[model samples]
Target: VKGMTQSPLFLPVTLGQPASISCRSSQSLVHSDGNIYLSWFQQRPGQSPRRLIYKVFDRDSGVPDRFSGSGSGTDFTLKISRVEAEDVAHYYCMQATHWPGTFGGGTKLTVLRTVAAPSVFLFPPSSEELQANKATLVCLISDFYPGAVTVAWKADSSPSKAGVETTTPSKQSNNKYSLSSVLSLTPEQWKSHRSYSCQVTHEGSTVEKTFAPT
Candidate 1:
């Protein structure tokens, strides 16, 4: 019984605006006790986790009505009606239907949100860019802080990697940061009609910059 979130290491939400975190289970979380046992909890730096929503959608006593949970079996969600200064903290999900319940990776909620300004440039083949029989490729990410960088390589049409900026307005979450990963390989490392590809993830949004150099 494993609990999973969409890479929820951190999250940023607008004050007074709504936000949600999603979870998926490795197995259905139904117990023989006549109820599903999925739970969402909130935690601070020095305190133990406090149950916010238990048994799917039930709230704890004295809990704010702004919080809600939904879903069944393999998929679930934790929703906040509005994010406030007081709501800033880490949130986690767990599955208790099975013995030895499992916890998710969890996410720290940051209420003061910021946007990511990313510029994706995947350009190789400048003079001296290749030296000593090695090719150096560049993937640049500039500004704010939306995150994750991936690189792939394919020596043939079958598969590949390098890097590209992706373009898609995904869900919004912010962390202040920037990253750049470089690709360096030799002709001997890739000779059979080689190719490279990349995609940049700025938290919930992305841009793609893909090209096959001849």
Candidate 2:
């Protein structure tokens, strides 16, 4: 809880594919003797968390061999050799190396049927006048599948890391997904005539859309 850390969101995966879940901690999980005291769990919807792996990389009794754990210190990973229908659930990582033990935020793994690659689109950039100096740019991504996608922004061809916020991807009735991200800028920065772009990465490929001040 207090010292534990995990990804704020889950990653989407497909059946028969390999998947890896990450669980991080704010403090080192390694004991003085050099062994890690981490464990992994799986919680199906509406069910209690079940032990999957323990003590860094050992599978618990009755756990399927497909699930394995590895890593040390603050970085730990639980990997699935090949995803199956029964594997759909929420996974968590815990540390027992210190008192006040904690668990990760939990990663939900959603299963998808065979589907096409995601289609990407960018919304027309819009801005709001704020004190004659600030504005915001928004980007929309829709119709993506397997659900795991990445979004990034660039200004004038260089990586732009500014006031940025992204929404968690939401699943639709059709089994597809949609999400949006925004970037804030100063009017002067916007007027610099620099090109800005939103880049998306999914299924081992990347796509992007660019914008410029009109």
Candidate 3:
């Protein structure tokens, strides 16, 4: 049921450019006939499966040369010489040597239509609440796109783990996204810590917010 490996489950390609993905099997995908029994296919959304390349390098008729395949044995490579916005689809590889067949987990290719940097704001607990040992720090992240992000917390830049609660992203009216996180702590905890920070990573950009208690 397992043994085939496909990488870059998500592939973001440049418009009018090139992209490539890799696949490897548990064993050599060779046949007794001295040929590799590997094939590649493309599945467009809501459409029929299209055979792109087979025999590791033979481009199917009507398929562009940009769709090419290489490598052999237990390793293989599928190369897209150029990419286009309309070329968004899932690309898959199949191994059918000696055994019947098994499909590789396809890699999804898409263009970056919208990309926005995420911003974060950190808020410290009120003085009265801190005096009563009711300390809670909140981090609000907003105005991000693509809906993929990573949230990280730091105490004096040492990577905090305990007392952190993160929430799922909420969609905005303008099609952006927002998220919230919290760090629960006591007055003693805050006074003993040098600094608390929140980092929001989105679209290869990082937004950070740091607070030092007085």
Candidate 4:
């Protein structure tokens, strides 16, 4: 995949939860013949790998329809319905429509240890004036694990400290992964396009992706 030069291992996920993994190809899968063949794989921790889907959306032999595939051209998605405890393992999606078919970094689904609830909060924006000395903003992200996140603020595109506060236990029904992050920031940094980022690193890899609203 364009962004998956290295394979990633997933964390343990809980059963009966919904989960999804992404597989971005390195290049477009548009063939001269105009056909795309994408596939999904399931490799239990210690067992041999199993095929889940093939040729766009066809289920592989012995595979159930509960696992579905969708997408077109170069993008694709593989969704699993009602993940079972036995489903805990590494999940990968690959494309045969083009050479160098790529697989996504695996996603680990952990069973919920308790009934703890997750929370979300919004940070107040800086002054109405773009040049205000202080500003505030909110940060949001899904599938977050406790004690595995980093949130920061920057002024004029440079790093700054407005103080970061974290939140409670949230669950992603699909992956059984928790969702959370800090919701507070200072007014001075929330204005004038002051930048901030929310990052999570887990599963033997760093999920440090970022985004900024235009």
Best by TM-score: 3
Q: For model 4, what is the C-alpha lDDT against the true structure?
A: 0.56
Using alpha carbons, what is the TM-score of model 2?
A: 0.54
TM-score each candidate: 0.54, 0.54, 0.58, 0.48
Model 2 CA lDDT for position 137: 75
User: How should the candidates be ordered by TM-score, best one leading?
Assistant: 3, 1, 2, 4
Q: Using lDDT as the measure, which candidate wins?
A: 3
Window of ten residues with lowest summed lDDT in model 1: 163-172
**Clashes per model (N, Cα, C within 3 A):** 19, 0, 0, 23
Give the TM-score comparing model 1 with the true structure, all chains together: 0.54
lDDT tens digits by residue: candidate 2, 81-112: 99987897888888988876788888877756
lDDT of 4 by residue, 38-84 (tens): 77888876687688888768898887667888777666777778777
The lDDT of each candidate is 0.70, 0.78, 0.80, 0.56
lDDT of 1 by residue, 129-181 (tens): 44467666666665544444443433344444443233322233343444555
Candidate 2 lDDT score relative to the true structure: 0.78
Model 4 worst lDDT window (10 residues): 115-124
Which lDDT value does model 4 have at 154? Answer: 42
The stretch of ten residues in a row with the least summed lDDT in candidate 2 is 123-132
Q: Which stretches of candidate 2 lie over 4 Å from their true place?
A: 112-214
- Candidate 4's C-alpha runs over 4 A off are 1-14, 115-214
